[PDB]
DNA sequence: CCCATCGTAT
DNA sequence: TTTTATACGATGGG
């Protein structure tokens, strides 16, 4: 195997395929990147057995086919540390890979490419294209609601559902839920899959915010996304995800609307004096007014009064303020709408000017 | 106690005094700030028992004398969380301090001002004024060479020494050492003291990049620094700091000069493949040339060659590349000078065009 | 004091 | 002012 490439055409791919790696590998080979030269292209792959990131680089200079694997971190840092515009010549020399540039020489240890994990081929059942911004919007709007290493394995991920001409993402940890839908102008078959949290993270990281479309393929047990010269593939979580349609409150007749930022700043300040663990805050809604109070074990107390739009019956309800703040932070709109039912029922939060995304959060006991 | 101040006139001071605190105090009250209203001045103090930071804020609005202590982080977060230009009214009421602004209200638990740690009165024995830039240079030039948690307490700090018309700083961990001297335009008595590691950090933090003079007072067991409306005081570390004069190599006859960045980048790359434990690299000096090599347990190997200015005899010496990089990273100059003696001797390093600072690194011999 | 993650400055 | 071939300060915890 042999190839010579410009430092900059290499740093981009290397950085991307290193994503799957997460330190302290269970297998030493999972700490390496697979390098493959064939038909004028250099392919680099990074994986953690659950997913893989593949980058392809065009070889415009003389090269020789072949493959090997080398320490990802070490190789990336070496390339990163050479001077801008540096020419990096690489060649396999037995049990080690030689890297040369200017007057710098580096010999790295290798592991047989043949031993590199290889996700078994599979077949896509649903395919579609969409702008990176749409995919970016969908994940950002719900990612924060995904569960974190929760015993209910089916919650440690994000649901990606196709329905009609829409792609929707759903995320929940049992206490709060987020859902967002975006039309992708294509009649799609109805399909639902759970993408593991690490996969959603990688997916988001492969979006360079450009105009290049995203090509997505979904199989019975896998999802693949192609953007530019990168191909990401992840296994799916085998389980049954909650139905957002049954999570949304049934009868939230009490509607409250208020400026998003003023509402967020009030909760942010009140949260300072809320229980550090439970983080509960009390809301008292009355005619065009909202009273937010917070108390902690120290018996400290925060109170915020703000003008809002509300014409329903007065009521008091408690909420974990972090859950509320996460929603307001994600919205990033002008005004938000809170839909309540009673003190023992969840609340639904949405952008006042958009029902594309919905947020549900369970109340806390007084 | 009562006062009303604009948010912006309070934010800066709060951050300054919340410096020694950090997170998780060892003693509860250390997590509180002392607030004192006397005359037309509000004083705010933060401490960690070893040092204290005091800020003075002129009170132009009506006030009432008094003092108390309140959770520093909570108070700062409340103030910071209020809208720009907010007026912050504060009043003490029993065991709680009431904070109000617009329609936001906060009640903080207090601890008696009489309980607040107060360094005993002490006498200054040496005093001088110096430009803030001189203190910044002295600290930045030597800070990295201080020990961190050495059993020899005095190495976990920085020696500040007055001699003739110079102020000098020395820092060493026993493996490497840094010394820097600056003229301060005033004849002073010969004096030496050791400032604790955390104190050095704070001296640094209190510099504002302006022309405000830095007034220093040194006593048998304390050092005080005054800049603008801020006064920092720290206890000193007892001990006999090592004499840098005796640490500088005696006969470092072989002198090599090279570009600081080129040398730094080569060392940085070579470092990637050095023992992650001992981080040793080997240097080979020959006529106008430097060869840096490194290998690790994985049998990987790196080699850098650089054109340098050198006429002495050839020699091979080992070093902890981290120590070498720390110096080069500090010496942000055009060219560096490395003064060698032999394979079992230390190397002296300095800016090729300046002797104001010198660095010594123990060799790594086989 | 050391370590990992981190919103986000750069 | 959307972004990485990025970096150091704030941060929750041992």
From Swiss-Prot, chains A, B:
InterPro entries xrefs: DNA_clamp_sf (IPR046938), DNA_polIII_beta (IPR001001), DNA_polIII_beta_C (IPR022635), DNA_polIII_beta_cen (IPR022637), DNA_polIII_beta_N (IPR022634)
Region spans: 2: 129-243
Subcellular locations according to the entry: Cytoplasm
GO annotation terms (biological process): bacterial-type DNA replication; DNA damage response; DNA strand elongation involved in DNA replication; DNA-templated DNA replication; error-prone translesion synthesis; negative regulation of DNA-templated DNA replication initiation; regulation of DNA-templated DNA replication initiation
Keywords assigned: Cytoplasm, DNA replication, DNA-binding, DNA-directed DNA polymerase, Nucleotidyltransferase, Transferase
MF (Gene Ontology): 3'-5' exonuclease activity; DNA binding; DNA-directed DNA polymerase activity; identical protein binding; protein homodimerization activity
Assigned GO CC terms: cytosol; DNA polymerase III complex; Hda-beta clamp complex; replication inhibiting complex; replisome
Stored SMART domains: POL3Bc
Pfam families in the record: DNA_pol3_beta (PF00712), DNA_pol3_beta_2 (PF02767), DNA_pol3_beta_3 (PF02768)
UniProt biotechnology annotation: Small molecules can bind to the hydrophobic cleft and inhibit binding of various protein factors, suggesting this may make and attractive antibiotic target.
Induction / repression: Part of the dnaA-dnaN-recF-gyrB operon, but also transcribed from at least 3 promoters within the upstream dnaA gene, induced at 42 degrees Celsius. Induced 1.5-fold by hydroxyurea. A shorter isoform, beta* is induced by UV treatment and also at low levels in late logarithmic/early stationary phase growth (at protein level). Beta* transcription induced by naldixic acid.
Residue numbers spanned by region 1: 1-120
Major subcellular site: cytoplasm
Chain positions recorded as DNA binding sites: 24, 73, 149, 153-154
Annotated segments matching region 3: 245-365
Function according to Swiss-Prot or TrEMBL: Confers DNA tethering and processivity to DNA polymerases and other proteins. Acts as a clamp, forming a ring around DNA (a reaction catalyzed by the clamp-loading complex) which diffuses in an ATP-independent manner freely and bidirectionally along dsDNA. DNA bound in the ring is bent 22 degrees, in solution primed DNA is bound more tightly than dsDNA, suggesting the clamp binds both ss- and dsDNA. In a complex of DNA with this protein, alpha, epsilon and tau subunits however the DNA is only slightly bent.
Family named by the database record: Belongs to the beta sliding clamp family.
Complex and partners: Forms a ring-shaped head-to-tail homodimer around DNA, which can be opened by the delta subunit. Binds interacting factors in a hydrophobic surface cleft between domains 2 and 3, each monomer is able to bind different proteins simultaneously. The beta* isoform probably forms homotrimers which probably load onto DNA. The DNA polymerase III holoenzyme complex contains at least 10 different subunits organized into 3 functionally essential subassemblies: the Pol III core, the beta sliding clamp processivity factor and the clamp-loading complex.
Extra information: The temperature- and UV-sensitive allele dnaN159 does not grow at temperatures higher than 37 degrees Celsius. The global SOS response is chronically induced. The UV-sensitivity of dnaN159 is dependent upon Pol IV (dinB), it has an enhanced Pol V-dependent mutation rate (umuC, umuD), and is absolutely dependent on the polymerase activity of Pol I (polA) for viability.
Record's protein name: Beta sliding clamp
């Amino acid at each position: 195997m042999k190839f010579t490439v410009e430092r900059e055409h290499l740093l981009k791919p290397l950085q991307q395929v290193s994503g799957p790696l997460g330190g302290r590998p269970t297998l030493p080979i999972l700490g390496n990147l697979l390098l493959q030269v064939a038909d004028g292209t250099l392919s680099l792959t990074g994986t953690d057995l659950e997913m893989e990131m593949v980058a392809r680089v065009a070889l415009v200079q003389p090269h020789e086919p072949g493959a090997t694997t080398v320490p990802a971190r070490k190789f990336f840092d070496i390339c990163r540390g050479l001077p801008e515009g540096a020419e990096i010549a690489v060649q396999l020399e037995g049990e080690r890979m030689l890297v040369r540039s200017g007057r710098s020489r580096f010999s790295l240890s290798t592991l047989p490419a043949a031993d590199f994990p290889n996700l078994d081929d599979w077949q896509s059942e649903v395919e579609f294209t969409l702008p990176q911004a749409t995919m970016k919007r969908l994940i950002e709007a719900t990612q924060f609601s995904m569960a974190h290493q929760d015993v209910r394995y089916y919650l440690n991920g994000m649901l990606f559902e196709t329905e009609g001409e829409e792609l929707r993402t759903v995320a929940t940890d049992g206490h709060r839920l987020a859902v967002c839908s975006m039309p992708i102008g294509q009649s799609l078959p109805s399909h639902s899959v759970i993408v593991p949290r690490k996969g959603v993270i990688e997916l988001m990281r492969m979006l360079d915010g450009g105009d290049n479309p995203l090509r997505v393929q979904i199989g019975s047990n896998n999802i693949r996304a192609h953007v530019g010269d990168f191909i990401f593939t992840s296994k799916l979580v085998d389980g049954r995800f909650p139905d957002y349609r049954r999570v949304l409150p049934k009868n939230p007749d009490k509607h409250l609307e208020a400026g998003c930022d003023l509402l967020k700043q009030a909760f942010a300040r009140a949260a300072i004096l809320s229980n550090e663990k439970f983080r509960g805050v009390r809301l008292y809604v009355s005619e065009n007014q909202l009273k937010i109070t917070a108390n902690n074990p120290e018996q400290e107390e925060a109170e915020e009064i703000l003008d809002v739009t509300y014409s329903g019956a007065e009521m008091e309800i408690g909420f974990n303020v972090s859950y509320v703040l996460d929603v307001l932070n994600a919205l990033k709109c002008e005004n938000v709408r809170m839909m309540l039912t009673d003190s023992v029922s969840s609340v639904q939060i949405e952008d006042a000017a958009s029902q594309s995304a919905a947020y549900v959060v369970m109340p806390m006991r007084l």
